[PDB]
């Protein structure tokens, strides 16, 4: 149950999730794997900024779909 995380600069990882995962948790799964601080992470799907207190189901995040990332005070 995996999705792609992508920024605007050639960087993309694959991240293991569940549709029941909250957004602040995927942001934790990224800090776990790559070390970025989640209070600074911004996630975007279908052009909407992902509210922390919601789930991938709530945004209809499908599998092998791409989530966009930027980081506050770095690139957004």
């Amino acid at each position: 149950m995996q999705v792609f995380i992508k920024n605007r600069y050639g960087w993309t990882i694959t991240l293991e999730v569940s549709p029941t995962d909250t957004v602040e948790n995927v942001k934790q799964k990224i800090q776990d794997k790559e070390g970025f601080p989640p209070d600074k992470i911004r996630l975007i799907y279908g052009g909407k900024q992902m509210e922390d207190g919601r789930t991938l189901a709530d945004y209809n995040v499908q599998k092998d779909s791409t989530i966009l990332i930027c980081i506050r005070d770095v690139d957004c």
């Binding site: 605007r8 960087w11 790559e34 975007i44 052009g47 980081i71 005070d73 770095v74 957004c76």
Partner: protein
């Protein structure tokens, strides 16, 4: 036609529009108007500012640009944790990133100088501030977030003598082997120089004016008489150098160098924090005050002459919102009472990239509140100032475009533009 908008002899392309729309996307901007129209117009307004800046010879010294870039990179490393992540995220070396960032930093600083010139003489009176706010709804009073004042004492960790000696030993050995034909300068720089950006070019800096080099390096480099002699060991803020001349070409010199950095260990960081904790203990004992300790003992150039009081670059005052603080200080201050002195902690200062050790005192904390004219004047005044500045710049844009060559792609003719009432649709 890929051209959207011409300003003078500069074109805004559809690809430029797409990039700006994606930037707005990642920033999560919300648009009251049509972004198809709003964004190209914003790109054209930017070109008007740059255009006027050419006419008015508004220039930004390269020094100030590099300082802003270095400041941002350091903030970036703080946000990303490590330099190595930052490099992965942009998928570029720190020096490639510095290069890319300089254009945007220069242009940003040019526009800001252009705007200050255009609308810097705007003033507001207290009566005007009161009026602006009296004349608005109840739910639209500005909230002033919690703001702290913070005093700091900093000390660099001490490098053990044996480590400085080890660096000097290697530099004399590199010097010896190159002089004797046993090793070439470029190979030793590739292998050993810790200036990453020049090392991969066999130590070559590229051409540089005297003021663009740290002074200890400039002194030594312009005294070099030929392309064979290796300079004496010279210490700079970056570490220890040996320098060889490549070419004097005009007023600027190209050199190659090998930079060695003495190592800071956990042992020296611990010892520095212990000296600072001892200083803190004397202040808690009232042997001397925090003000006196900062003025006598702190190595923080920016604050040591004013009792260690930190200055907020955001609002020009001593008042910080918690997010305007260096992240290591914010985290310590958050747990602190007024008047407390922190345990000593290691941080990376954002102005130079160097690990330093610090203690901070919480001078004051003012909890969040609705603003009042009596006690939050500066806060309310800045709001009103910024609105009057904005109104002046909008009026200026309308005058400037009437005196500038402009052409708009006719696929945008249905747009309601802010600043152009009857634009010419040729290009």
């Amino acid at each position: 036609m890929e051209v959207v908008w011409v300003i003078g002899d500069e074109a805004i392309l559809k690809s430029d529009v797409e990039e700006a729309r994606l930037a707005a996307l990642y920033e999560g901007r919300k648009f009251d108007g049509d972004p198809y129209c709003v964004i190209p117009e914003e790109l054209a307004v930017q070109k008007l500012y740059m255009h006027q800046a050419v006419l008015d010879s508004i220039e930004v010294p390269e020094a100030e640009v590099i300082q802003r870039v270095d400041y941002q990179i350091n903030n970036y490393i703080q946000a990303m944790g490590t330099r190595e992540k930052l490099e992965e995220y942009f998928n570029k070396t720190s020096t490639q990133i510095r290069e890319a960032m300089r254009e945007n930093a220069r242009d940003g600083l040019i526009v800001q100088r252009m705007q200050q010139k255009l609308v810097g003489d705007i003033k507001v009176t207290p009566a005007e501030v009161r009026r602006y706010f009296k004349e608005l709804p109840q739910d639209s009073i500005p909230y002033v977030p919690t703001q702290v004042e913070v005093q700091i004492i900093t000390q660099q960790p001490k490098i053990p003598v044996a480590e400085i000696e080890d660096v000097k030993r290697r530099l004399r050995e590199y010097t010896d082997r190159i002089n004797k034909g046993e090793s070439d300068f470029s190979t030793l720089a590739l292998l050993y120089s810790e200036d990453r950006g020049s090392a991969i070019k066999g130590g070559e800096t590229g051409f540089m004016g005297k003021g663009q080099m740290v002074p200890e390096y400039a002194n030594v480099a312009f005294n070099l008489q030929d392309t064979k002699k290796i300079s004496k060991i010279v210490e700079s803020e970056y570490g220890f150098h040996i320098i060889q001349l490549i070419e004097k070409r005009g007023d600027r010199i190209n050199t190659r160098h090998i930079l060695l950095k003495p190592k800071v260990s956990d042992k020296e960081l611990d010892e520095a924090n212990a000296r600072l904790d001892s200083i803190a203990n004397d202040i808690r004992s009232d042997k001397f005050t925090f003000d006196q300790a900062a003025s006598a003992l702190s190595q923080d150039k920016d604050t040591r002459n004013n009792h260690g009081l930190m200055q907020n670059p955001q609002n020009q005052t001593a008042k910080f919102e918690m997010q305007d603080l260096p992240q290591e200080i914010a985290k310590v201050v958050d747990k602190m009472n007024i008047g407390e002195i922190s345990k000593a902690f290691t941080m990376v200062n954002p102005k130079d990239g160097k690990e330093v050790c610090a203690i901070v005192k919480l001078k004051s904390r003012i909890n969040g509140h609705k603003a009042t004219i009596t006690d939050d004047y500066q806060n309310l005044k800045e709001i009103v100032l910024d609105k009057r500045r904005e109104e002046a710049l909008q009026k200026w844009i309308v005058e400037k475009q009437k005196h500038t060559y402009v052409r708009i792609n006719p696929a945008w003719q249905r747009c309601d533009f802010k600043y152009w009432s009857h634009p010419q649709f040729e290009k």
